Amino acid sequence: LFIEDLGKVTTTLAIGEE
Amino acid sequence: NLDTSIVVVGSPDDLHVQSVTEGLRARGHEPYVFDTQRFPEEMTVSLGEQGASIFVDGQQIARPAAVYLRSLYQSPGAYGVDADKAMQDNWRRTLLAFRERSTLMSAVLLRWEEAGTAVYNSPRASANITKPFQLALLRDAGLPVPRSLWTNDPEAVRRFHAEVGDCIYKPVAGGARTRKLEAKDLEADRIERLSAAPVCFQELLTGDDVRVYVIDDQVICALRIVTDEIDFRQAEERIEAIEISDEVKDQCVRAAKLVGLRYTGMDIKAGADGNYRVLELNASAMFRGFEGRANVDICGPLCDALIAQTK
Amino acid sequence: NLDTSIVVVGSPDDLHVQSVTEGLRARGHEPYVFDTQRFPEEMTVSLGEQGASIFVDGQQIARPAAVYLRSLYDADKAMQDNWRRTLLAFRERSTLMSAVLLRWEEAGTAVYNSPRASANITKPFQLALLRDAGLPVPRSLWTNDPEAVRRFHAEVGDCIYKPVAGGARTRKLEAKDLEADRIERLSAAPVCFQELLTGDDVRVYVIDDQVICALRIVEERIEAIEISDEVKDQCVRAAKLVGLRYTGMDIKAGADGNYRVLELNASAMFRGFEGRANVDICGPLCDALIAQTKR
Ligand SMILES: Nc1ncnc2c1ncn2[C@@H]1O[C@H](COP(=O)(O)OP(=O)(O)O)[C@@H](O)[C@H]1O
Ligand SMILES: [Mg+2]
Ligand SMILES: [Mg+2]
Which protein residues have their CB within 5 A of the ion that is ligand 3? B 267
Q: Which long-range contacts (CB under 8 A, 24 or more apart) does B218-222 make?
A: B218/B253, B219/B244, B219/B249, B219/B252, B219/B253, B220/B296, B220/B298, B220/B301, B221/B294, B221/B296, B221/B298, B222/B248
DSSP-derived pairing of the beta strands B45-48 and B32-34: unpaired
Q: Which of B47, B147, B198 sits opposite C142 (nearest CB)?
A: B47
DSSP state of B30: P
Among all residues of chain A, which has the CA nearest to that of C78?
A7
Name the pairing type of β-strands C246-253 and C259-263: antiparallel
Kindly identify the ligand whose nearest atom is closest to the C-alpha of B224. Answer: 1
Closest to B2 (Cα-Cα) out of B31, B39, B36:
B31
Helical axes B91-115 vs C123-131, angle rounded to 10°: 20
Q: Which helix (H) or strand (E) holds B255?
A: helix B246-259
Angle between helices C229-242 and C123-131 (to 10 degrees): 130
Which positions in chain B touch C129 (Cβ < 8 Å)? 51, 114
Q: Strand B199-203's sheet: what is its strand order? A: B179-180, B167-170, B199-203, B148-151, C45-48, C54-56, C59-60
CB C53 within 8 A of CB C107: no
At B243, is the secondary structure helix, strand, or coil? coil
Disruptive mutation site among C88, C91, C93, C96 for chain A (greatest number of A CBs within 10 Å): C88
For residue B150, list its beta bridge partners.
B200, C47
Q: Are B298 and B220 in contact (CB under 8 A)?
A: yes
Residues pairing with B49 in the sheet:
none
**For residue B276, what are the β-bridge partners?**
B270
What is the Cα–Cα distance from C48 to B132, expressed in whole angstroms?
Answer: 8
Q: Tell which residue, C85, C88, A2, C89, has the closest CA to residue B182.
A: A2
At residue B36, φ and ψ (nearest 5 deg) are -70, -15
- Taking alpha carbons only, the member of B57, B79, B67 closest to residue B110 is B67
DSSP assignment of B138-199 equals HHTTT-----EEEES-HHHHHHHHHHH-SEEEE-SS-SS--EE--HHHHSHHHHGGGGT--E
Q: How far is CA C208 from CA B82, C203, C240, in A?
A: 45, 17, 9
Q: In chain B, after which residues does the backbone break, taking C–N over 2.5 angstroms as a break?
A: none
Residues 6+ apart with CB under 8 A from C39: B152, C45, C93, C96, C97
Greatest CA span in chain B, whole angstroms? 65
Give the minimum alpha-carbon distance from C104 to chain B in angstroms, rounded to a whole number.
10
Q: Give which of C35, C33, C38 is closest to C8, Cα–Cα.
A: C33
Phi-psi region of C149 (alpha: psi -120 to 50; beta: other; left: phi over 0): alpha
In 3-state terms, what secondary structure has residue C124?
helix
Q: What angle do CA B302, B12, B59 make, to 5 degrees?
A: 90
Give chain A positions within 8 Å (CB) of C89: 1, 6-7
Strands B59-60 and B54-56, bridge-based pairing: antiparallel
B136 DSSP 8-state letter: H
Separation of alpha carbons B54 and C49, rounded Å: 42
CA distances from C191 to B6, B233, C34, C285 (A): 29, 58, 36, 34
Q: Which of B279, B282, B286 to mutate to test the pocket of ligand 1 (most atoms within 8 A of CB)?
A: B279
Of B104, B140, B173, the CB nearest to C91: B173
CA distance B50 to B255: 35
Task: Please name the helix (run of DSSP H) or strand (run of DSSP E) that holds residue B95, with its range, or none.
Answer: helix B91-115
Q: Cα–Cα distance between B220 and B157 in angstroms, integer?
A: 38
Secondary structure class of B8 (helix, strand, coil): strand
Angle CA(B163)–CA(B165)–CA(B170) in degrees, nearest 5?
100
Q: Are C29 and C35 in contact (CB under 8 A)?
A: no
- Whole-angstrom Cα distance, residue C67 to residue B223? 43
Pairing of strands B199-203, B209-215: unpaired
Structure determined via: X-ray
Distances (CA, A) of C147 to B64, C61, C111, C151: 24, 55, 44, 6
Alpha-carbon gap, residue C32 to B204, rounded angstroms: 36
Q: Strand runs (DSSP E) across chain B, as ranges?
A: 6-9, 32-34, 45-48, 54-56, 59-60, 66-69, 118-120, 148-151, 167-170, 179-180, 199-203, 209-215, 219-228, 236-241, 263-270, 276-281
Determine the Cα–Cα distance for residues B277 and B51; give it in Å rounded to an integer: 42
H helices present in chain C, as ranges: 15-27, 76-79, 83-107, 117-121, 123-131, 146-156, 180-183, 229-242, 271-274, 282-291
Determine if residue B273 is labeled as part of a ligand binding site: no
* Closest approach atom of ligand 1 to CA B204: 3
Quote the CA–CA distance of B83 and C111 in Å, as a whole number. Answer: 36
In sequence order, the 6+-apart residues with CB closer than 8 A to the CB of B187 are none
- The chain A residue lying nearest C90, using CA atoms, is A1
Cα–Cα distance between C188 and C164 in angstroms, integer? 12
Quote the CA–CA distance of B109 and B262 in Å, as a whole number.
15
Q: Interior CA angle at C272 toward C259 and B103, to 5°?
A: 60
Pick the closest to residue C248 from C294, C286, C215 (CA basis): C215
Q: CB A14 to CB B174 under 8 A? A: yes
Subunit contact C40:B76, Cβ cutoff 8 A: no
The torsion angle over the Cα atoms of residues B287, B291, B297 and B303, rounded to 10 degrees, is 30
Residue C241's contacts (CB-CB under 8 Å, 6 or more residues apart) are C120, C129, C130, C133, C135
User: Quick count: other Cβ atoms within 10 Å of Cβ B129?
Assistant: 21
How far is C295 from C287, CA to CA, in rounded Å? 14
CA of A14 to the centre of ligand 2 (A): 7
Element (H, E) at C247: strand C246-253
CA of B286 to the centre of ligand 2 (A): 11
3-class secondary structure per residue, C187-215:
HCCCEEEEECCCCCCEEEEEECCCEEEEE
Separation of CA C85 from chain center = 29
Mutate to test the pocket of ligand 1, among B170, B225, B281, B286 (most ligand atoms within 8 A of CB): B170
Terminal CA-CA length for chain C? 23
CA nearest neighbour of C105 among C119, C89, C117, C93: C117
Q: Is the dihedral of CA C192, C231, B51, C242 positive or negative?
A: positive
Bridge partners of C263? C250
C-alpha span between C55 and C219 (Å, rounded): 47
Q: Residue B206 CA: which ligand 1 atom is closest? A: 4
d(CA B165, CA B156): 14
CA distance C101 to C86: 23
Cα B267 to Cα B55, B221, C47, distances in angstroms: 38, 12, 21
CA angle C222, C226, C232 (to 5 degrees): 115
Q: B132-157 burial string, b = 16+ CB within 10 Å, else e? A: bbbbbbbbbeebbbbbbbbbbbbebb
How many whole angstroms separate alpha carbon C212 and alpha carbon C206?
A: 6
Inter-chain CB proximity C86 and A7 less than 8 Å: yes
Could you give the CA distance from residue C175 to residue C186 in angstroms, rounded to a whole number? 15
User: Is the Cβ–Cβ distance between B283 and B311 less than 8 Å?
Assistant: no
Which helix (H) or strand (E) element contains residue B289?
A: helix B288-294
Which residues lie closer than 8 Å to C275 by C-beta, 6 or more apart? none
- Residue B61 sits at φ, ψ, to 5 deg, of -135, 85
Burial of B251 (0-12, 13-18, 19+ CB in 10 A): buried
Could you tell me which of B155, B120, B124, B122 has the C-alpha nearest to residue B287? B120
Rounded Cα gap, residues C246 and C161, in angstroms: 27
Greatest pairwise CA separation for chain A in angstroms:
23
List Cβ neighbours of B296 (8 Å cut-off, separation of 6 or more): B220, B221, B223, B241, B290
Other beta carbons within 10 Å of C159: 20
Helix (H) or strand (E) holding C222: strand C222-224
End-to-end CA gap in chain A:
21
CB B267 within 8 A of CB B280: yes
Nearest to B177 among A11, A14, A17 (CB): A14
